[PDB]
Design a protein around this nucleic acid. Structure first.
Ligand SMILES: *O[C@H]1[C@@H](O)[C@H](n2cnc3c(=O)[nH]c(N)nc32)O[C@@H]1COP(=O)(O)OP(=O)(O)OP(=O)(O)O
Lengths: 919, 329
DNA sequence: AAGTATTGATATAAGTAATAAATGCAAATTGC
DNA sequence: GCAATTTGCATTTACCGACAATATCAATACTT
RNA sequence: GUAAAUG
């Protein structure tokens, strides 16, 4: 049976739709089975195996593993019920007069509801699952997550049980409940082990506990492991019965449930959150407030359209991939099977210590290469196994957003954001007529898949026409031939398109042909495009293809020419690195650097990327770090001299982020913070995207503190306790976050409009994918949505939003005492200190300012007069136009963000006629 | 006939790496008189002394001009200090060597094949009579080397294969307190346990007077440290400095098992032994509760345990039928 | 006055050492 | 003001000399 | 922490 071939064989769309409905009805049950969680089936299986073993009367431990687990569950249940009894006793009593008791009730409210029955399932499965989790075998696991993972699994059970009908659990509570439950499991975990006496060498039979607590020493720091007995190690290894409760995430088989709330959507029976919040309470609070208000309907529509497109696996490409994999040696991307690591020969101990350390570094290099190849082989094997399992089915991909808004799939193993193989093994499920333009668009897609996207459309089609013979030969013989697709920039997608085009050319009339291969439309340097659109800079807009034209300018080619000129003038002087690198600078070696410069990649990241692109050439094979850093310096000089309008906006955003991260609330900080003189900064940069999604930057100073648990004190960090913000992280992360939010907003608008028009839309950040027949309509939609997004002044709206949200805030700053303005501040403080009777401090000044705002904000007219009469530290600065010009005692300053950098003139509507803008 | 470097001469030195030296011939002669090193070593001529981190060399010069051993050895790596030593001690009968005492292969080379320094071997019954070691490890960072030598005492691999060798050790004042902690004291640790097991120590000298409150009074009165003020050491920024005498003694137990038991017990140094046995292995609490018939030991904390009690616990752990493999570590 | 509790420091092990030499990215940030 | 100084966009996967360290004790803080 | 992938 093969549903894809059945679908292709069905001639008419009416019975195609009927078959689709029948397939949906049939696969509903399979989807439910796939999403099933083993928190009840495991218990039923254990009970059944125990009963059958008892009925038989004779069994052995290997098949009695489930019997032992059933015994453990039976012995555990009374203890957890007793704990719930204690919980009810402490919680029910209304009196709240603690008598210095050692009893803890904070966890009790957490684990009261439902943990009386299903809980032993989770303790058993998790403790068994983490068998050699963090190299505790030296058998065993680190207690750090062992308590946390148990607690997290319990929380997920509460959340999973609610969808079938304290939103975020604290790390302290999760650690407490995990510790309690693991201790209870340790108490009654028993196993029989036979030993030999040392004195008499006689066999002994004696039961021993299964799980034992312990500690280990690593470089002078305790670790606190939790170990498992040898007999259980053998039985688990000899049976391979993991029986996990959380299934690995897989592509769906049914249309994903449409997004309605921030917690409802995605998988049918597994809950998901609209944002990939790294357990930050502020982001969750803001997202929930936005969802309750109901102003992200367009985001919901965009996500629904992104997730509604069905996929399937490409059998023809999968066969070639499987053949290469079964051969098992080095290929385009598959590293090949390295059976065993070869230990290099070592020099004798009599050799020099420098030679000995050289040998040690050689062995380290060999080990690193072996480990990298092992990891890549494991990833490829996982991906191939999933592809083989899902071949012939109707895939789906529910999508999710990170805290900026960019769209990612929910299945992290097999998706279209993977590598070249991952993208190649996927084709659209629906078949659409190629039409008059589909043949041209397929040829263009192949042409720019080989990497020749710097040439016009007619030249690309001419190149495809020139190489059609090699296309046909390659598709006829994927191997045992010229292997032409191997030379392509993206060989696997190139190979799939070669198959596609060959099948087209064998057909007499290409227009009647039904194609499935997606067609990639992408923009070049999306960050530069968005900066040009924001700043209205025509000089950059013409450089990055915003303005209509007939020849597509290449920013990468331009910067490559500049770097070549720099290396030429350096080689004229006579630098050896200049001589080496002068002629071998290409587009690719600076593509990543220039693309991610807008993204905020620093010098080290630039060196890493440029070395990554330099390595495959092997021209500098042994070590190219010095060449990498010199070349990054030159590339940075070129980028600086090239871009200025982008840099103005970047600097404005960064400096505003700094001023926000150095701010103090007027009202919250009035409470004493145990410091007085030095305040703590608790404000994070927050803004709203044009769609309506509120963004809260999570960068904060996270400090680990020991939390008290039954087993030990676990050294974890609880994010729920608010902490001072990381000003440097916020300043360095505001610009790229803003740009990526704009990218995601444009994605969602374009996806919503395309879905309304009826297209099949799949997007990977900048690139948007669609059938070859719908490329023109998608392009029109994209340009319209870009116009709608950038018609208004986004930077001006951002400044207005900042000034409206942060109206009643003050900043701290140091100013010279010699300033006459500072003298009046001391004059006001002298009266202020005397009235209170104690020394005046910054906290007292903030309290006075809040009192003034209390008089000003009062709707009563008589109250406003007193506010004007009351003069405070912030009252002095109401007349100073330029705070920077005025700026030795620390004094309060009002928070005033700089006015937006000058906006050039550019009618963004002009790109509607442009064709090389996004292609 | 060896000139002691002058305080001005030490003053010219720029790099000390954090190692505090002493420049008082009076204090050195008082310490030597207290030690009475001629009692154990009744041949001044037959003595062969190896020093580690000699530094300025005032102690070495005083020792040579007082005893005149057959060959005095100095093992230093610091460039400036080596230059100073060669400049000041040129033409002297003293021998200057440029090596690194941290590197294990240094002693193995020096004794085994080139044999620039050939020691002499002695039986383990009595104190060695030809080989003496004097060390200065006052640098704060290098306190781990002291524990390494303490373990080498038991392993009989570094230099104690020649016999039992007396060590004249300069130590940071905090490491002295860590090592010389009587049972029940707050500063007791596995370092103190291994010190008690392998050697008997007498705190010869200590600079800071206030520091003496951190030791045990009955041991202080018997030891009689030669107190000196803090201004007698050239680098005055560092913490106080102590000297100990390290005499290896005979012992009878399995070193690896004893190390494992002490290490896994003193992670919890205040929990009663009624419960901490479980950390050793699976069912260890039950097994040791069954085997031990003494209630006092069942209630004593590991910080109060003595070496005899630790050896008894090691013997019981060996007698355990289901003991896990310590060698996995 | 009686207390009790939350916070902060210090040690733990022992060859991925230390200290000074070395070197490089610079810059936005953190000590005095 | 001055010297040093420690990092620097998002998402996912695999692997490991090993990754969120823990026990205890005193000093400050709070409550009665 | 190491490596890789994507933008
Ligand atoms: O900088 C890291 C590193 O020292 C250590 N660490 C964390 N996870 C691992 C691991 O799997 N293997 C090794 N050898 N070391 C590890 O902890 C430090 C702190 O880690 P981060 O704060 O960067 O957080 P996270 O664990 O999420 O990092 P990563 O695993 O994603 O890189």
């Amino acid at each position: 049976i093969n549903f894809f071939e059945i679908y292709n064989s069905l001639p008419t769309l009416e019975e195609k739709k009927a078959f689709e409905s029948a397939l949906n009805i049939f696969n509903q049950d399979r989807q439910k089975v796939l999403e099933n969680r083993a928190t009840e089936a495991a218990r039923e299986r254990w009970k059944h195996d125990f009963e059958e073993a008892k009925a038989r009367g004779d069994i052995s431990i290997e098949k009695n593993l489930n019997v032992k687990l059933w015994k453990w569950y039976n012995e555990m249940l009374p203890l957890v019920k007793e704990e719930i009894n204690h919980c009810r006793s402490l919680l029910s009593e209304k009196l709240s007069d603690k008598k210095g008791l050692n009893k803890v009730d904070t966890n009790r409210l957490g684990y009261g509801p439902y943990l009386t029955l299903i809980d032993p399932g989770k303790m058993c499965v998790i403790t068994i699952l983490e068998l050699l989790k963090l190299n505790s075998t030296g058998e065993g696991m680190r207690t750090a997550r062992a308590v946390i993972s148990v607690g997290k699994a319990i929380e997920m059970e509460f959340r999973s049980e609610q969808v079938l009908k304290k939103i975020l659990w604290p790390q302290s509570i999760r650690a407490r409940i995990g510790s309690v439950l693991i201790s209870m499991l340790i108490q009654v975990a028993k196993v029989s082990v036979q030993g030999v006496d040392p004195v008499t060498k006689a066999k002994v039979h004696g039961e021993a506990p299964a799980f034992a607590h312990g500690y280990q020493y690593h470089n002078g720091s305790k670790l606190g492991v939790l170990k498992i007995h040898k007999t259980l190690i053998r039985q688990l290894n000899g049976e391979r019965l993991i029986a996990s409760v959380q299934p690995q995430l897989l592509p769906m088989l049914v249309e994903p449930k449409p997004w309605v709330n921030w917690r409802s959507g995605g998988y049918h029976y597994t809950q998901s959150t609209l944002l990939r919040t790294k357990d930050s309470p502020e982001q969750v609070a803001y997202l929930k407030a936005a969802s309750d208000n109901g102003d992200i309907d367009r985001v919901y529509d965009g996500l629904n359209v992104l997730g509604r497109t069905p996929w399937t696996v490409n059998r023809k490409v999968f066969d070639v991939v499987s053949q290469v994999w079964n051969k098992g040696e080095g290929f385009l991307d598959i590293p090949g099977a390295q059976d065993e690591m070869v230990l290099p020969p070592a020099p004798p101990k009599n050799s020099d210590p420098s030679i000995l350390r050289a040998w040690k570094l050689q062995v380290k290099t060999i080990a690193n290469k072996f480990s990298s190849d092992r990891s890549n082989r494991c990833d490829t094997n996982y991906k191939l196994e999933i592809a083989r399992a899902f071949l012939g089915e109707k895939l789906y991909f529910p999508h999710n957003l990170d805290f900026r808004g960019r769209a990612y799939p929910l299945s992290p193993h097999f998706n279209h954001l993977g590598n070249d193989m991952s993208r190649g093994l996927l084709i659209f499920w629906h078949g659409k007529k190629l039409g008059p333009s589909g043949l041209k668009w397929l040829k263009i897609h192949l042409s720019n898949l080989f990497g020749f996207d710097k040439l016009p459309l007619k030249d690309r089609v001419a190149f495809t026409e020139s190489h059609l013979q090699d296309i046909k030969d390659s598709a006829e013989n994927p191997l045992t031939g010229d292997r032409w697709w191997t030379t392509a920039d993206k060989p696997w997608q190139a190979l799939a398109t070669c198959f596609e085009l060959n099948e087209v050319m064998k057909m007499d009339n290409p227009e009647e042909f039904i194609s499935h291969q997606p067609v990639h439309q992408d923009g070049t340097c999306n960050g530069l495009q968005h900066y040009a659109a924001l700043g209205g800079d025509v000089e950059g807009a013409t450089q990055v293809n915003l303005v209509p034209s007939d020849k597509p300018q290449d920013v990468y080619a331009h910067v490559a020419r500049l770097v070549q000129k720099r290396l030429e003038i350096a080689a004229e002087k006579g630098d050896e690195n200049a001589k080496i690198l002068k002629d071998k600078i290409t587009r690719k070696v600076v593509k990543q650097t220039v693309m991610t410069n807008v993204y905020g990649v620093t010098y080290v990241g630039a060196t890493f990327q440029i070395a990554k692109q330099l390595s495959p050439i092997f021209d500098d094979r042994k070590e190219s770090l010095d060449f990498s850093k010199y070349l990054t310096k030159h590339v940075f000089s070129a980028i600086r001299e090239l871009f200025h309008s982008a840099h103005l906006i970047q600097d404005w955003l960064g400096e505003s982020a700094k001023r926000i991260s150095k701010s103090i609330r007027l009202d919250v900080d009035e409470k004493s913070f145990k410091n007085g003189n030095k305040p703590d900064f608790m404000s994070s940069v927050i803004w709203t995207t044009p769609l309506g999604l509120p963004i809260v930057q999570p960068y904060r100073e996270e400090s680990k503190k020991q939390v008290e648990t039954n087993l030990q004190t676990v050294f974890i960090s609880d994010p729920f306790a608010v902490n001072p913000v990381n000003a440097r992280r916020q300043k360095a992360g505001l610009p790229p976050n803003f740009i990526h939010s704009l990218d995601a907003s444009h994605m969602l608008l374009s996806a919503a409009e395309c879905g309304k028009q009826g297209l099949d839309f799949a997007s990977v950040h900048d690139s948007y994918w669609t059938h070859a027949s719908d490329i023109d309509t998608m392009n029109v939609v994209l340009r319209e949505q870009f116009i709608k997004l950038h018609e208004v002044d986004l930077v001006l709206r951002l400044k207005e939003e900042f000034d409206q949200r942060y109206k009643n805030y003050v900043k701290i700053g140091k100013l010279k005492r010699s300033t006459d303005l500072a003298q009046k501040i001391i004059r006001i403080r002298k009266d202020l200190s005397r009235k209170l009777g104690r020394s005046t401090t910054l906290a007292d000044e903030i309290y006075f300012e809040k009192k003034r705002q209390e008089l000003l904000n009062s709707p009563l007219i008589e109250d406003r007069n007193v506010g004007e009469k009351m003069v405070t530290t912030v009252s002095l600065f109401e007349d100073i136009t330029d705070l920077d010009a005025l700026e030795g005692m620390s004094v309060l300053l009002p928070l005033r963000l700089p006015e937006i950098p000058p906006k050039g003139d550019f009618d963004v509507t002009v790109l509607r006629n442009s064709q090389y803008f996004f292609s | 006939s060896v000139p002691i470097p002058g305080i001005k001469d030490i003053s010219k030195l720029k790099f000390f790496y954090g190692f505090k030296y002493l420049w008082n011939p009076t204090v050195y002669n008082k310490i030597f008189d207290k030690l009475d090193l001629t009692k154990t070593y009744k041949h001044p001529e037959e003595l062969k002394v190896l020093d580690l981190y000699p530094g300025v060399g005032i102690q070495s010069a005083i020792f040579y001009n007082k005893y005149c051993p057959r060959q005095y050895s100095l093992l230093e790596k610091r460039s400036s200090l080596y230059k100073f030593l060669n400049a000041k001690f040129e033409g002297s009968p003293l021998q200057i060597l440029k090596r690194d005492p941290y590197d294990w292969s240094t002693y193995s080379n020096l004794i085994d094949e080139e044999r620039i320094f050939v020691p002499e071997v002695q039986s383990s019954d009595h104190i060695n009579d030809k080989f003496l070691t004097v060390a200065n490890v006052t640098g704060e960072g290098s306190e781990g080397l002291i524990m390494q030598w303490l373990s080498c005492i038991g392993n009989k691999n570094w230099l104690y294969r020649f016999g039992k060798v007396k060590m004249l050790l300069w130590m940071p004042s905090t490491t002295a307190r860590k090592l010389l902690a009587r049972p029940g004291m707050h500063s007791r640790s596995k370092c103190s346990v291994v010190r008690e097991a392998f050697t008997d120590t007498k705190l010869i000298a200590i600079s800071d007077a206030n520091e003496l409150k951190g030791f045990d009074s009955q041991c202080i009165e018997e030891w009689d440290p030669i107190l000196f003020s803090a201004a007698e050491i050239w680098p005055t920024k560092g913490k106080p400095i102590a000297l100990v005498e390290m005499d290896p003694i005979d012992f009878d137990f399995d070193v690896d098992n004893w190390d494992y038991v002490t290490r896994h017990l003193m992670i919890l140094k205040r929990t009663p032994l009624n419960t901490v046995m479980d950390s050793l292995g699976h069912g260890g609490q039950q097994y040791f509760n069954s085997r031990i018939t003494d209630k006092d030991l069942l209630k004593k904390c590991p910080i109060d345990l003595t070496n005899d009690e630790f050896i008894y616990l090691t013997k019981l752990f060996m007698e355990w039928p289901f003991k896990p493999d310590i060698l996995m570590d």
